Each structure stands twice: as C-alpha cells, then as structure tokens.
C-alpha cells in the first residue's frame, strides 16, 4: 500500500494553508479504483477519492498537487474560477509545467 | 484514419488568429506514434506531430487546444513565457479544466 504518513501530512498541511480547518473533522482521503478519473470528491461527505491504480505512478509533488486540486474543488465548487486558480498557483508556482508533464506521464 | 477536414480547419484558423500566416507554407500536421507525448514539434521543420494512438480519444475541443498549444511553442519557443500563457488562456479560457480532464481521460 501507499505510505499513509506522507498522505496524512499533505492532507493536514494543505487543509491548513487553504483555511479549510473548519472541515478537518469531515475531510478524509479514500483510495479505491476509479473508472474514468485520477481523483474525485464526494461533496456531500467531503471525501477525496484517489484512484488506487494511479497512486503508485505519482511523484510526491504530484500527490501534493492533486490533493490541493481536489481540496480547491471542495472549497470553491465545480469550476476553476480566478480565486481557485490563484490559490492553486500560490501552492504550486510551477503548476502549468506540472500539468503538461502529468498528461504525458500517465497516458495508457 | 482521423478526419482530416477538422484538422485542416483548426490548423488554418489557429495559425491565422496567432498571426503565424507567414509560416503557413511551412507548418504541417503529421500523425505518428509518440513514445511519451500527446503531441510535439520539430521547430526546424515547423512540423506538429500528433500521437497516432491518442488522437481517436480526443474531443474536438481537446484537438483545438493541443494544436494551439503546439503552435504557441512554434511561435514563442520551448517555454511558457507570460505572452505564451496569456495567448493560450485567451484561446481557451477553460484551459485548466481541459488539462485536468485530459489527465482523467488518457490514464483510463
Ligand atoms: Zn508547452
Ligand atoms: Zn479541477
């Protein structure tokens, strides 16, 4: 299985810097097979799902990026509005290169 | 094979709006297997390569996006400098969601 220690720390750190601590009792990561996604959310119970089949291929920085991306959907909703994009760029100044690198790494 | 009609139209429309018509005599799309990329360029020849294996899975909007992305590499060089990023966002205001949707689709 994937090391829970780094996931626990990334989740706690990212919730703190995104000012989501009011939702710390609700937000949890669950690792399960996902049909057509690398990650998803259940807005109802604040669960972040990570695709069990993707997780071994992700670098630590990519896991930080994907968790921040899903937390920003929990914070702002379905769309990448300017506030969402500004916070994501603040957490990941190199997010454009990360994104282009990710599609090229994962196509199966 | 992938319908050439939409590729011809997207290529000519995008070259025109990116003010690259003085390179219309040189820029061509070639479809071939690519080892670790969805698309690439050869700025010496001005050829845009599209990965033969990924092309059937791309939506029309994704093809428009990928061609604009590679044309901007032909226009500005290797790096996503501010002018590059501004033009890409102008052509595709929803580019962040396009990039994440591309990741989800090509991993499955
Ligand atoms: Zn690029
Ligand atoms: Zn998103």
Curated annotation (Swiss-Prot), chains A, B:
Gene3D superfamilies: Metalloproteases ('zincins'), catalytic domain. This is Uncharacterized protein MJ1213. To M.jannaschii MJ0123 and A.aeolicus AA15. InterPro entries: Peptidase_M56.
């Amino acid at each position: 299985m994937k090391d829970r220690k780094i996931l626990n720390e990334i989740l706690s750190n990212t919730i703190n810097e995104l000012n989501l601590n009011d939702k710390k009792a609700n937000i949890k990561i669950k690792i399960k097979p996902l049909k057509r996604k690398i990650a998803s959310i259940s807005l109802t119970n604040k669960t972040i799902y990570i695709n069990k089949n993707i997780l071994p291929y992700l670098s630590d920085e990519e896991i930080r990026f994907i968790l921040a991306h899903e937390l920003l959907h929990l914070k702002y909703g379905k769309y990448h509005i300017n506030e969402f994009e500004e916070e994501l760029l603040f957490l990941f100044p190199n997010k454009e290169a990360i994104l282009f690198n990710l599609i090229n790494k994962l196509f199966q």
